[PDB]
Ligand binder design. Structure first.
Ligand SMILES: C[S@@+](CC[C@H](N)C(=O)[O-])C[C@H]1O[C@@H](n2cnc3c(N)ncnc32)[C@H](O)[C@@H]1O
Lengths: 420, 6
């Protein structure tokens, strides 16, 4: 309203140029603020430009020097501590060059990430989806970073960090914000740390998006990828995102069948398990592990990785095709490989039923094992979804979790049908 | 490493 107007003056001050055809709005958007087309936009049309000096990063913030200087102290699993300190500093800075930008940020106490859910609810609603595992790892990292890194740094530089921002709760909120709002610029291998991109982080996300960001030497450009008719919301793409990643990172899901990018994971060791399960002999077991290790050498499998199954195609395609090949090939045919490229080809809805019986059976069994890791079967969730009035009576978190579980089980069950 | 790349 006024914050929007203030933000737009700020844009002009810092050289951020919006097309007259786009409008920042809170009306008719899928969530919070979004951008809407004032006039129909053509594919390839420039929607806005953000100068690189307008970005909020460890490098542009007012303590960029101190942060760079202390880059070793500030290391972590995520690599976000420097950005989080820039944000923490800028938020308590009286004359922050980014105030009008912060004014459009969401209310930090109302973030929807499952990390803020009661632990039993998260654990129970999202079992088998991979979310509880990811959140648990996040929470551990967030807590260790705050105590051993972020809090002692702030206390070492009280001038730069008022007491009101020395907050564990706040640190959780800013991590969530970085997760949901930040951009990471692709390289070209030391991955670029995330930055906050004003205006660009106003756009909501869809699998079927109509805008995307381009990087250039001096600026970022948001460009239309599809024609956008008058009055229609402009949707960026946050990536090829399954619902389990959307809810974890962004606190939302796309309702079935909207998410054409949804996926289900089959843990790599589950495939191994299926292979072991089929053995009759302690000798047969050990020949399984030999095939496993060979795949670990090819870097096709690993103890904590997963195969990623898409709606029309397997995404970790060569990993899986090669895993099936090796685990299933005649024991003689294997010894000559273990002595003397990998397996090409697509794994799609049409291809899978044409695979060898042995590949399909191993896959079938792996999927059965995977489906057993959820609390209920697909029929239960399919029933909660099919009845709109039953669905409507579920809490918001229950609806979200349902969409995640349902999307995953459907893909798994489709794979079950394809492997007969 | 900050996730949303575009
Ligand atoms: C980069 S921000 C987009 C701007 C956001 N709507 C706001 O008001 O500040 C990403 C956040 O927007 C929301 N969001 C983005 N796309 C969405 C969608 N398709 N459906 C529901 N919420 C969405 C989620 O809350 C997500 O964490």
């Amino acid at each position: 309203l006024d914050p929007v107007a203030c933000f737009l003056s700020w844009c002009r001050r810092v050289g951020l140029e919006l097309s007259p055809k786009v409008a920042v709005s809170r009306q008719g958007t899928v969530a919070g603020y979004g951008m809407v087309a004032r006039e129909s936009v053509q594919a390839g049309e420039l929607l806005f430009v953000v100068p690189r000096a307008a970005l909020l990063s460890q490098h542009t913030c007012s303590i960029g020097g101190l942060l760079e200087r202390e880059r070793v102290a500030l290391q972590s699993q995520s690599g976000w501590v420097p950005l989080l300190l820039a944000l923490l500093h800028e938020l308590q800075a009286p004359a922050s060059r980014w105030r009008p930008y912060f004014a459009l940020w969401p209310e930090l106490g109302r973030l929807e990430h499952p990390m803020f859910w009661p632990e039993e609810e998260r654990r129970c609603l999202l079992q088998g989806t991979g979310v509880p595992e990811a959140v648990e790892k996040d929470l551990a990292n967030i807590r260790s970073e705050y105590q051993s890194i972020v809090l002692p740094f702030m206390e070492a530089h009280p001038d730069l960090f008022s007491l009101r921002v020395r907050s564990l709760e706040l640190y959780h909120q800013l991590v969530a914000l970085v997760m949901a709002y930040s951009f990471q610029e692709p390289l070209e291998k030391e991955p670029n740390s995330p930055v906050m991109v004003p205006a660009a982080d106003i756009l909501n996300h869809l699998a079927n998006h109509n805008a995307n960001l381009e990087y250039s030497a001096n600026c970022l450009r948001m460009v239309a990828t599809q024609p956008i008719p008058k009055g229609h919301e402009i949707f960026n793409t946050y990536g090829q995102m399954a619902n389990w990643q959307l809810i974890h990172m962004y606190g939302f899901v796309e309702p079935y069948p909207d998410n054409t990018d949804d996926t289900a994971d089959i843990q790599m060791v589950t495939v191994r398990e299926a292979a072991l399960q089929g053995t009759k002999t302690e000798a047969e077991r050990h020949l399984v592990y030999e095939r496993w290790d060979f795949l670990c050498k090819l870097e096709m499998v690993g103890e904590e990785g997963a195969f990623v199954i898409g709606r029309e195609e397997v995404l970790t395609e060569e990993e899986l095709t090669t895993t099936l090949k090796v685990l299933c090939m005649p024991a003689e045919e294997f010894r000559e490989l273990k002595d003397q490229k990998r397996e090409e080809g697509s794994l799609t809805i049409t291809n899978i039923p044409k695979l060898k019986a042995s590949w399909r059976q191993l896959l079938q069994n792996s999927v059965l094992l995977t489906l057993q890791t959820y609390a209920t079967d697909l029929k239960t969730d399919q029933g909660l979804l099919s009845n709109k009035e039953v669905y409507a009576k579920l809490s918001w978190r229950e609806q979200q979790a349902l969409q995640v579980r349902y999307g995953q089980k459907m893909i798994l069950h489709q794979l079950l049908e394809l492997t007969s | 490493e900050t996730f949303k790349s575009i």
